[PDB]
Design a protein around this nucleic acid. Structure first.
Lengths: 131, 88, 136, 158, 84, 185
RNA sequence: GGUACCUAACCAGAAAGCCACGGCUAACUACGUGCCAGCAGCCGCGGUAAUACGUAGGUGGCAAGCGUUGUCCGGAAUUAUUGGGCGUAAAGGGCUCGCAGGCGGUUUCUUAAGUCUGAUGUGAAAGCCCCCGGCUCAACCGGGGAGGGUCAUUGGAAACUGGG
RNA sequence: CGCAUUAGCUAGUUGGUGAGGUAACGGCUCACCAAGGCGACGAUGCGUAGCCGACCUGAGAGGGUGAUCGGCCACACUGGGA
């Protein structure tokens, strides 16, 4: 049964992105919405749209390919997993591909990028890396 | 009793001492309560440095300085500060 | 394995047993038991001295001794160098070093130590053969 | 393109290889060769021949046809990568100036001819030189330039 | 200045069969050193309860004391939640 | 120990002039004996060691000490090596060769801030004034016998280490990266 | 202990060995031996051209040391958390039902055990590292600092995990 | 720390009530009463070990050591008592 919904969203992207699909549709949650909002603000995806429903909702994500059909997302990794969580101190907040990629950290301050979190001097649950 | 005495550090023919507060039964270079300063009799002149606030704290608790420590305290003017405190 | 599976039953490192296991005992006379003490050489008494045939494709007469060590273990040793003075009842010093081509031979006798004499007319690698520096 | 750059070559190895035939064995010389400008272009070839000096010359020509461009920030690469090519598995971590090329065997040939001066590395997999160099070049092909990402992501390099 | 504090532990009762004596259990999460997963650890404690208030199942508070026997180093303070 | 052997065959093996003049490599610029990557790394280490004339154990530790400093490891490693007093004496021109400069120091002809230093491997620091002692002011070898990081005065026979070299001043024959490589094994 | 140190006088005079040299691995030739004597960590070498045996000349690496053995760690992303796997290479339980255990969809409120963060106390001295200073240098020694807790105590934040 | 090719272990044992004893709390001891207590989170047994600051190795995680120096413990022919 579904155990990691976040991993699933990351994997959905990864897979769509592998076959250069235009868009994909992920069952929503508050955190999935927040993740997707980050990806947009960092320019890993073109757009995100929220479709409401009787069930949980749907997030539509629109993948972003540069000219020469180059993928903007190279990779996405789930770090903290259900079967072994990972938390980072503020000084240990991970750099991803030496700054070209990003880390999404769930913090008390909120779900932030690595840059974001390091500025607010926060740590928290390291959800994913994206490069 | 609690003493104030010299702990031998340094190397074979070049002694250096730290002035430590120590119970009497403790081994010379072993267990001690607090470091109070440092005496380097080898240099010319003998380099002495003492942290009064502790030295006096421990004189007034009734740690007794060993003969040399006493004389080191004298030259920095501790023994005066100790004597004048018991009066005023 | 899953993390939970490691928490339950961890990783188990291998055992790396000694290349020279007769050096790695002692013997306590009073207790009559083996000690577990590694040593860099041992002493022992030659119970036999002979020659062995190497395993193929090598061919020679390889000079060996059958030594009973101070710790009461009995071991075959190789006798290196050209020509030696070991008979039965010689007191020898064995070191570590298997001879590859001699099945059973895990130790080398030390030349120049105890009753084992140095190699005669050796002039290069002398120290490895227990031989003093010829001139003066 | 290879006829405007001036390339140093390095022989990585030469195996004698052997095909069974009716009356015995046909021995040839398979020369594996890296070549580079020492300014961010590197690449490798093989040549097979009946005599060694020709096998090298064939391999060198091959390497000039299959160059790649290595992205380099300062004297190092932009960011960490793990270049895989079947069992070949090379870690490449960027390093501070004056570090030197801390790398092993074939991987060193590639990086030194590429013109990386400061890099950490480690062969985490196979050491068969062909697939070690393949892996290394996979790695160097997958390095992303910080300007190129910024144009992809629609951001500043700052 | 004020008194220094004894340790307090909120736990669950797992026996009442002894006279005036409950066996509380405290369940806490100790990290594994190597792996980093938190693991459920249980520590039983004998505590002294004078009026036999606490029964098997109850979520009790306890406080450390001087030794009250070979094993009892705690007294029952409160019964925070009763059994079902 | 020190190497007291022939100075030329070292130059000839390495394929550089260690004296800096060229003269070991005038007649026979090829290896000693009848036959005239690890190699090249080793060659480069032995280049720099044999030039300045230190034994490996002291050289490997002078490299470990230079690592702790801030900047390029190879660069800073050459800088200390240059600071050695035997070398500074030789650079100030008080001696014709490094082996003379050593012996000058070792036998106690040199002063550093007025005081006798009889240690070739003394690591000279900026500000410090190298001088000859008064017993040895009229040594033949000194009278017989300069970079910008140093300053000299041939009247007074006393120099000064005014700054640290900077690497462009030091021996450009040396690829110090190779030596940093040599040690990373 | 007339010991360190210092001054004066005399003499290159009294003071270099050890291992290696086929590859790994720096540095090669000759003679002797001829699967023998021997070498060897490994691949192996030795039956007439032996750079691998023994010697000699030289060369190389170190140096008052140099080799050898033993033991430990590394090389060994070779018990793999970092950091491996299981079609055919070693590796999917013969198959179920399941107790414990591990894991758990979506929203909102709340707690705050986890988690993040602050302050305080403590984690001796020496050591290691850093910055200085003393021995002619260094080793060594000293001073000031830093580090180091599944740490205690007491405040904050509340997304995530755990309660309710 | 190792061992399940060690799974049960305990009967002053676990708790209580008194008294005695101790510098002091306490099965510490004794009497009486109760039936408890511990253990698959590994009890119990067997084997091995003084522990630590540190030290060695390693990119680190980790592994190995616990000479010297400092802390703590234990022991003083062996077993027991004052």
């Amino acid at each position: 049964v579904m155990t990691d919904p976040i991993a699933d969203m990351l994997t959905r992207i990864r897979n769509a992105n592998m076959v250069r699909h235009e868009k994909l549709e992920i069952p929503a949650s508050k955190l999935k919405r927040e993740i997707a909002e980050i990806l947009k603000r960092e320019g890993f995806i073109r757009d995100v749209e929220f479709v409401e429903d009787s069930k949980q909702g749907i997030i539509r994500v629109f993948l972003k390919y540069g000219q020469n059909n180059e993928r903007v997302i190279t990779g996405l990794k789930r770090i903290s997993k259900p079967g072994l969580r990972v938390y980072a101190k503020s000084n240990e907040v991970p750099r991803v591909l030496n700054g070209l990629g990003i880390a999404i950290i769930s913090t008390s301050q909120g779900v932030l990028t690595d840059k974001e979190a390091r500025a607010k001097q926060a740590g928290g649950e390291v959800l994913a890396y994206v490069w | 009793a609690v003493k104030i005495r010299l702990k031998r550090m340094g190397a074979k023919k070049s002694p250096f001492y730290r002035i430590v507060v120590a119970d009497s039964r403790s081994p010379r270079d072993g267990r001690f309560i607090e470091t109070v300063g440092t005496y380097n009799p080898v240099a010319k002149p003998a380099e002495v440095k003492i942290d009064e606030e502790l030295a006096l704290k421990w004189l007034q608790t009734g740690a007794k300085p060993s003969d040399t420590v006493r004389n080191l305290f004298s030259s920095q003017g501790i023994m005066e500060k100790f004597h004048n405190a018991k009066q005023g | 394995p899953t993390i939970n599976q490691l928490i339950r039953k961890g990783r188990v490192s291998k055992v790396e047993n000694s290349k020279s296991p007769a050096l790695n005992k002692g013997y306590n006379s009073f207790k009559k038991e083996h000690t577990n003490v590694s040593s860099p050489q041992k002493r022992g008494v030659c119970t036999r001295v002979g020659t062995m045939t190497p395993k193929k494709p090598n061919s020679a007469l390889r000079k060996y001794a059958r030594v009973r060590l101070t710790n009461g273990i009995e071991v075959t040793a190789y006798i290196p160098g050209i020509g030696h003075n070991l008979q039965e009842h010689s007191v020898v010093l064995i070191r570590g070093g298997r001879v590859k081509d001699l099945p059973g031979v895990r130790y080398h006798i030390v030349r120049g130590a105890l009753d084992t004499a140095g190699v005669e007319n050796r002039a290069q690698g002398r120290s490895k053969y227990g031989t003093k520096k010829p001139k003066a | 393109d290879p006829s405007k750059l001036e390339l140093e070559e390095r022989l990585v190895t030469v195996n004698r290889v052997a095909k069974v035939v009716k009356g015995g064995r046909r021995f040839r010389f398979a020369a594996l060769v890296v070549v580079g400008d020492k300014n961010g272009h590197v690449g490798f070839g093989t040549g097979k021949a009946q005599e060694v000096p020709e096998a090298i010359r064939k391999a060198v020509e091959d390497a000039k046809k299959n160059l790649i461009e290595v992205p380099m920030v300062g004297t190092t690469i932009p960011h960490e990568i793990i270049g895989r090519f079947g069992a070949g598995n090379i870690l490449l971590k960027p390093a501070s100036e004056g570090t030197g090329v801390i790398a092993g065997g074939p991987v060193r040939a590639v990086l030194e001819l590429a013109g990386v001066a400061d890099i950490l590395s480690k062969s985490l997999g196979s050491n068969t030189p062909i697939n070690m160099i393949r892996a290394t070049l996979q790695g160097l092909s997958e390095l992303k330039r910080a300007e190129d990402v910024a144009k992809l992501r629609g951001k500043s390099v700052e | 200045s004020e008194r220094n504090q004894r340790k307090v532990y909120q736990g669950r009762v797992v026996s009442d069969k002894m006279d005036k004596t409950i066996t509380v259990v405290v369940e806490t999460y100790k990290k594994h050193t190597l792996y980093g997963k938190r693991v459920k650890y249980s520590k039983k404690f004998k505590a002294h309860d004078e009026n036999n208030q606490a029964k098997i199942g109850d979520i009790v508070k306890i406080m450390e004391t001087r030794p009250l026997s070979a094993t009892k180093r705690f007294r029952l303070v409160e019964v925070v939640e009763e059994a079902v | 120990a020190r190497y007291t052997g022939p100075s030329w065959k070292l130059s000839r093996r390495l394929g550089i002039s260690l004296s800096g003049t060229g003269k070991e490599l005038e007649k026979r610029p090829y290896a000693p004996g009848p036959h005239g990557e690890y190699g090249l790394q080793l060659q480069e280490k032995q280049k720099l060691r044999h030039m300045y004339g230190v034994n490996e154990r002291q050289f490997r530790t002078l490299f470990d000490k230079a690592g702790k400093l801030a900047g390029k490891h190879g660069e800073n490693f050459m800088i200390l090596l240059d600071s050695r007093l035997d070398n500074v004496v030789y650079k100030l021109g008080l001696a014709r060769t490094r082996r003379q400069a050593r012996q000058l120091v070792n036998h106690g002809h040199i002063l550093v801030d007025g005081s006798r230093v009889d240690i070739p491997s003394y690591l000279v620091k900026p500000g410090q004034t190298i001088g000859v002692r008064e017993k040895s002011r009229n040594l033949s070898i000194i009278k017989e016998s300069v970079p910008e990081y140093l300053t000299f005065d041939a009247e007074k026979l006393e120099g000064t280490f005014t700054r640290l070299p900077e690497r462009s001043e030091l021996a450009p024959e040396i690829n110090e990266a190779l030596i940093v490589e040599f040690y990373s094994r």
